[PDB]
Write a sequence for this structure.
RNA sequence: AACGCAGCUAGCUGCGAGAAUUAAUGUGAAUUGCAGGACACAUUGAUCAUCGACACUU
RNA sequence: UUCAAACGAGAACUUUGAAUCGGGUUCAGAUCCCCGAAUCUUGGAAAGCGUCGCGGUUCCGGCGGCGUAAGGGCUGGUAGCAGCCGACUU
């Protein structure tokens, strides 16, 4: 008749919210007879009270769009609200470029492809924004190494 | 005198030797073991403690500390105490949870008072 | 807790006056010998079965033995 | 001034862990809402009053 | 906000259903009670948690079964090669 107490106890025992607690609609008499956490544990084993499943919230709709968004399907001029810097900061773009270029110079130095003197000159030039790409930097040593070979010969 | 400051010299101090005691006789200890324990408690929640925790519940004088409670129950009912937990009820009475030693049991003891 | 690493130490710490009991735990890959002392619960782990029984015969007498398995 | 004290008691009143009172004296069969307890009433005692003994928590 | 049911003399409005740490323990207390530990491994799987069952129906708070187009990186030896891997952008 009065099942406010049993729903609170069931939620505490089931460690779920009261919205997820289901009381048997045509067995109400002996849940009303339950007044202790022991009696609640009696009923959830017998199936009179069970924990309702969580309400479904599927991410498949968003997952499908991200795959399309992976190919730039919704990245047009009409789907951008923030600034170009806001969407992709220029500092992090510059910060990434110095790291991936300075790493290459270190690798070329330890691999004896280039010497310390050439390393320092390029290290100041990469900081000078003269190169913008690994490939753009990479072919630069080649003409630099090519004339050096010609100079000796 | 090797110091430029003058300090008060320390003089003899005599222990007081009264010509008569100001109090004729020592005050009687009015807070004894019978005063320590007021009465045992019989509420529903209490009964759980005697069975599952080997613990007795008592209403005690508000001025008694945990040490005083432990000695009183020992000589009053000839048992041993492991630990005592006390709290002050909202009504102003002090409730003490006295846990007996493992060798003693609260069931047979609480029969001796007649509470159980 | 403390881990006893070599066999000889374990039967010593089991002989201390404060050692109350030893509990033997039987796992799929090892057997753990845990002795409850006054301040620490010392555990000796052996990975091979045959040494477990021979040590089990050699506990000091009178010390309580509990078999978890 | 505070806090406690009645078998059932919140206030008022009285009292102070001896806590709606102890002792003693006078008096002399009750108290009372209920119950219980009483009660040779001197081989000496309920109640009430008096009050000089005792006691009087922070 | 609606439908149905229950209790009830009575229902828009009540209830149910549908739209110093770890672990346990109460009706109401837990770092305080109980247990166990103290001030990658021991702790530790025994616990706990998921499910699948067996007992019992104010007693069992009892048992078990399973599972826990362009922007880069890495690896092995002509201006790199070869392979593999990875977001977000213009």
């Amino acid at each position: 008749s009065m099942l406010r107490l049993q729903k609170r106890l069931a939620s505490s025992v089931l460690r779920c919210g009261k919205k997820k607690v289901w009381l048997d609609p045509n067995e109400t008499n002996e849940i009303a007879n339950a007044n202790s956490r022991q009696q609640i544990r009696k009923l959830i084993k017998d199936g009179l009270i069970i924990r309702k499943p969580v309400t479904v919230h599927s991410r498949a709709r968003c997952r499908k769009n991200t795959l399309a968004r992976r190919k730039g399907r919704h990245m047009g001029i009409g789907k951008r609200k923030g600034t170009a810097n806001a969407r992709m900061p220029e500092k992090v773009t510059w910060m990434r470029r110095m790291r991936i270029l300075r790493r290459l110079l270190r690798r070329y130095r330890e691999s004896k492809k280039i010497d310390r003197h050439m390393y320092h000159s390029l290290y100041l030039k990469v900081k000078g924004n003269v190169f913008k790409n690994k490939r753009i930097l990479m072919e630069h040593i080649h003409k630099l190494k090519a004339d050096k070979a010609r100079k000796k010969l | 005198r090797t110091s430029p400051t003058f300090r008060r010299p320390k003089t003899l101090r005599l222990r007081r030797q009264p010509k008569y005691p100001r109090k004729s006789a020592p005050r009687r200890n009015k807070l004894d073991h019978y005063a320590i324990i007021k009465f045992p408690l019989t509420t529903e929640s209490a009964m759980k403690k005697i069975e599952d925790n080997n613990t007795l519940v008592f209403i005690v004088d508000v001025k008694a500390n945990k040490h005083q409670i432990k000695q009183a129950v020992k000589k009053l009912y000839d048992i041993d105490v492991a630990k005592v937990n006390t709290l002050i009820r909202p009504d102003g009475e002090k409730k003490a949870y006295v846990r007996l030693a493992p060798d003693y049991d609260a069931l047979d003891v609480a029969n001796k008072i007649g509470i159980i | 807790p403390r881990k006893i690493e070599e066999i000889k130490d374990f039967l010593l710490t089991a002989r201390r006056k404060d050692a109350k009991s030893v509990k033997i735990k039987k796992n799929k890959d090892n057997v753990k010998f845990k002795v409850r002392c006054s301040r620490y619960l010392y555990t000796l782990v052996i990975t091979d079965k045959e040494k477990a029984e021979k040590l089990k015969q050699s506990l000091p007498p009178g010390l309580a033995v509990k078999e978890l398995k």
Observations:
- Chains C and A do not touch (no CB pair under 8 Å).
- DSSP finds two helices and five strands in chain C.
